[PDB]
Inverse folding.
RNA sequence: GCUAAACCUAGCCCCAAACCCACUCCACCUUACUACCAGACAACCUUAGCCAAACCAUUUACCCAAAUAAAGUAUAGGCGAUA
């Protein structure tokens, strides 16, 4: 008599079932003795909203805009635009060594960084 | 060591072919148990 | 429809694709080889032709092995190729009587064996046949190395073989560290079984164990593209200077 | 958008319209119409092209193509191959009779030569500059692609930027300086947000 | 007395008896899921 | 029309690939 | 009788017929009298001699045994020093 | 009811297409070609039916022997049952014994 | 006159050929599709029977990897059925 095809949500089942199932919202704390909830300030996401005063970009773009070819950014292009000028400048001067790769922007280990590329530890 | 032989003759399989075993080939008779030697 | 290849060839096809392709050739040939185990629970004819008593004619005869069931607990001991015999019998050895189910189990014993190469004593569950094979081989170490994989019928026995082969291959000095003379004597005794260390590491490993071992060897962190792009940039700059 | 059924029959009414839904309900299953396969490069009829009707009541007449339906190899010529139907009919009013064009197959029309207004066969050829254009077989004359209004109903020439339209100078301004920093890192520096606490290592499995 | 009401609904019993976790608890139950996956069942279990 | 060229027994010995699993075993022995 | 075998798709031969009857190539079947080795002490020598004879089968029995044996047993054999060689062919037979 | 009210579309048969015009060619390849190739080698179809004929039971036995290992599990199971039923039908049922 | 009738496609079957298939984000072995806490539970083990023998009790074909042939022969079997 039960509906197997319907989505199993928190509105179905006895009182224990309904209070344990959620809707995908992330938790922001934990429960202590006496069913008291402690909300962690750091677990609550913070919206980093910039100042939009004096901003010249609008949601839409005027149709009098020349069409441009789509060139997706790759690692090779990013390396050339950011790191190649630094290495070439030192190569001509004659002061270039593999020990100073961190000077050009290389990061040997992501540990110790607030935002780690892999594994990712930051939100969008 | 328990040594047994089949009651029923197994048909020849030939060169490079595995023998065909019917369920009647599971019937065994005790030949000799080496622990009594 | 129909399969391109027969079903029984699917396992062999898998060895030609994936991580199994990169397994060592000497190990893969060991899996492909399937030698006939030494007869244990049946008596071989010993001749390829026998004269039939009835018609007095020369008839070809073949040895059909008795199927043997090896319990999982047999892998922790050395049963010498013995195992459970799952079969049928006739009551009072009369074919006109009932056909009953009969299981023959080897008589298991707990014995302690010392390995000269490993310099250790093992408490191994063995049968009376295992004792005879060791006695005929003049020691446990000879028995483990001489006995083929299909006749050992024990994962522990193959693991013992790999340990002994590794020590012989490496001339491992951990065997009696304070007696260099005694260590060389034992290695000289078993010098005929010495094989290269590369091959000895893969002896006795199952397919799953070999795949896991191969995966660990091939497991390495990816090289960051920063280092790769630096090498190309440095090389190209040098080539530009030559043309100038 | 709408996932059409496997054998949806395209018609004069555009898919997803009110008329199309009545003609093609979700449960309809009609016999597929066999359509000759024409490659996109092989197709040579476009909106605004002048073609001459070969078969029908208006055989030999020339007109301008107003709509092309690739799913049926159809070209619609304005004011040609037309039948008359009543529009806006009510209970009291009989309605207004208007000419209604009927679709024509690609083989029932023939593109005209710009120099001599006669039907001619064309082939796709590349010019010296490399552009792909249509060339008449008999005369070897380039037939330009007609200028048709864009489907979005926007004229770039007659366009005035609104209160929410970014100007061309601001839109094309390049303010991106490449660097080995993420968007999150750059915003923290830009907004002066300081975080000294270090992120603890976690187990991933 | 009157029959036909042998099914007295209970979510706890239904999930404990025919649930996904119950199916995977035994090798026989896993084959039950495999048969339903092979047949294309929309609902593999409760 | 014109008939296709007649089916002929292909000249020369036929050597199957020994590394192919679909190759019959009787075509790889010394007897073959 | 197995009209179509499960492995070859061919008619099989009932081996009980082979162990008891001999088929002459002319189509006749030769058998021995039943009970010719049973209770000889209570049978007269005239009766015992008839039991030792090798008799033929009638049309129905001969036709029955032909169906129960394959074409291998109906071929012409040239055994050396065959005792029944002279009986494989008919002589002076009308209709 | 049960009969169509309109004539079916006419049957257009090209009696002189390439397939019909060259039908039967090379059927005497053995006779006119020094017996290098048997005519049965021209037959194209199932690998268990080239130059061979039999009843339903013989075809099922032959197909299982030749391509039984390449058949699908469901197809093989139906073939095995068909042989069992045909074995009982031919060897145990019928008017003549 | 109604009720109805009529249709030619959707696709499918048998072969050949060729060795298929998994992952945008997020969720999913706990009550699957449930962001976030101490595991150490872990796989192997003869198919039987209907049925045939006009009962039934020994026995009763079941791809095992080359088409054909040897051959339904040798042989096995309540020496029966049949294999
Ligand atoms: K019959
Ligand atoms: Mg229901
Ligand atoms: Mg042979
Ligand atoms: Mg077999
Ligand atoms: Mg009910
Ligand atoms: Mg109750
Ligand atoms: Mg389905
Ligand atoms: Mg899923
Ligand atoms: Mg019966
Ligand atoms: Mg009864
Ligand atoms: Mg006999
Ligand atoms: Mg009988």
């Amino acid at each position: 008599g039960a509906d197997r095809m319907s989505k199993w949500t928190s509105k179905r089942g006895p009182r224990s079932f309904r209070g344990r199932k959620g809707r995908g919202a992330k938790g922001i704390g934990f429960l202590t003795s006496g069913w008291r909830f402690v909300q962690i300030k750091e677990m609550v996401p913070e919206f980093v909203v910039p100042d939009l005063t004096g901003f010249k970009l609008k949601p839409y773009v005027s149709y009098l805009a020349p069409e441009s070819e789509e060139t997706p950014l790759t690692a090779a292009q990013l390396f050339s635009e950011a790191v190649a000028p630094a290495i070439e400048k030192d190569f001509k001067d004659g002061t270039f060594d593999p020990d100073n790769l961190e000077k050009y922007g290389f990061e040997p280990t992501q540990e110790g960084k607030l935002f780690q590329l892999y594994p990712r530890n930051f939100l969008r | 060591t328990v040594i047994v032989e089949r009651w029923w003759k197994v048909p020849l399989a030939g060169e490079g072919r595995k023998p065909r075993l019917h369920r009647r080939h599971r019937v065994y008779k005790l030949v000799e148990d080496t622990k009594h030697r | 429809p129909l399969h391109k290849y027969p079903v029984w060839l699917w396992k062999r096809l898998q060895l030609r694709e994936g991580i199994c392709s990169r397994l060592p050739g000497h190990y893969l040939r060991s899996l492909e080889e399937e030698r006939t185990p030494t007869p244990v629970h049946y008596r071989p004819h010993g001749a390829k032709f026998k004269i039939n008593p009835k018609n007095g004619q020369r008839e070809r005869v073949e040895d059909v092995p008795i199927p043997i069931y090896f319990p999982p607990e047999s892998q922790r001991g050395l049963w010498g190729g013995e195992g459970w015999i799952l079969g049928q019998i006739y009551a009072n050895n009369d074919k006109l009587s009932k056909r009953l189910k009969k299981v023959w189990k080897p008589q298991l014993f707990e014995r302690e064996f010392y390995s000269e190469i490993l310099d250790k004593k093992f408490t191994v569950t063995v049968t009376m046949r295992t004792l005879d094979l060791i006695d005929e081989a003049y020691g446990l170490d000879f028995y483990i190395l001489k006995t083929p994989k299909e006749d050992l019928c024990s994962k522990f026995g193959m693991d013992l073989k790999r340990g002994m082969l590794l020590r012989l291959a490496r001339q491992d000095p951990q065997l009696h560290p304070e007696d260099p003379e005694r260590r060389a004597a034992i290695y000289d005794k078993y010098k005929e079984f010495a094989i290269p260390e590369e091959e000895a590491e893969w002896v006795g490993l199952t397919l799953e164990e070999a795949i896991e071992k191969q995966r660990l060897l091939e497991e390495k962190d990816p090289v960051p593209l920063f280092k790769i792009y630096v090498a190309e940039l440095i090389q190209q700059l040098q080539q530009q200077a030559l043309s100038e | 958008k709408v996932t059409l059924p496997p054998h949806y029959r395209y018609g004069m009414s555009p898919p997803g319209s009110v008329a199309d839904k009545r003609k093609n309900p979700p449960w309809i299953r009609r016999r597929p119409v066999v359509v000759e396969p024409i490659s996109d490069e092989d197709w040579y009829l476009f909106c605004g092209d002048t073609v001459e009707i070969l078969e029908g009541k208006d055989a030999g007449k020339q007109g301008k193509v107003v709509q092309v339906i690739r799913q049926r190899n159809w070209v619609v010529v304005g004011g040609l191959n037309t039948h008359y139907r009543y529009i806006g009919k009510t209970m009291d009013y009989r309605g207004t009779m208007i000419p209604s064009e009927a679709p024509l197959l690609h083989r029932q029309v023939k593109l005209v030569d710009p120099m001599d207004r006669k039907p001619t066969e064309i082939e796709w050829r590349f010019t010296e500059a490399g552009e792909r254009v249509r060339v008449s077989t008999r005369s070897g004359r380039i037939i330009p692609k007609p200028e048709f209004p864009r489907a979005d109903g926007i004229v770039p020439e007659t366009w005035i930027d609104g209160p929410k339209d970014t100007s061309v100078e601001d839109a094309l301004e390049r303010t991106y300086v490449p660097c080995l920093k993420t968007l999150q890192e750059e915003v923290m520096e830009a907004m002066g947000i300081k975080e000294t606490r270090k992120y603890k290592k976690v187990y991933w499995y | 007395k009157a029959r036909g009401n042998e099914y007295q609904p209970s979510n706890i019993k239904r999930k404990n008896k025919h649930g996904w976790v119950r199916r995977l608890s035994t090798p026989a139950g896993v084959q039950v899921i495999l048969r339903r996956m092979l047949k294309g069942r929309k609902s593999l279990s409760h | 029309y014109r008939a296709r060229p007649p089916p002929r027994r292909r000249p020369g010995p036929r050597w199957p690939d020994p590394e192919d699993l679909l190759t019959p075993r009787w075509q790889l022995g010394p007897r073959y | 009788l197995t009209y179509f075998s499960a492995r070859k798709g061919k008619r099989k031969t009932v081996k009980a017929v082979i162990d008891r009857f001999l088929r002459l190539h002319c189509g006749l079947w030769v058998r021995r009298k039943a009970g010719y080795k049973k209770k000889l002490w209570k049978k007269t020598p005239a009766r015992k001699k008839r039991l030792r004879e090798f008799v033929f089968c009638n049309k129905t029995q001969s036709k029955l045994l032909d169906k129960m044996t394959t074409s291998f047993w109906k071929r012409r054999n040239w055994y050396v020093d065959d005792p029944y060689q002279k009986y494989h062919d008919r002589t002076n037979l009308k209709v | 009811i049960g009969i169509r009210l309109t004539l079916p579309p006419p049957k257009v048969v090209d009696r002189w297409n390439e397939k019909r015009a060259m039908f039967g060619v090379y059927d005497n390849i053995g006779i006119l070609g020094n017996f290098e190739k048997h005519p049965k080698e021209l037959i194209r179809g199932p690998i268990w039916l080239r130059g061979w004929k039999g009843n339903e039971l013989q075809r099922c036995i032959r197909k299982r022997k030749m391509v039984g290992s390449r058949m699908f599990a469901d197809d093989l199971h139906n073939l095995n049952k068909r042989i069992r039923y045909l074995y009982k039908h031919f060897n145990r049922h019928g008017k003549f014994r």
Observations:
- The pocket of magnesium ion (ligand 3) is lined by residues B 14 (CB under 6 Å).
- The longest strand of chain A covers residues 29-32.
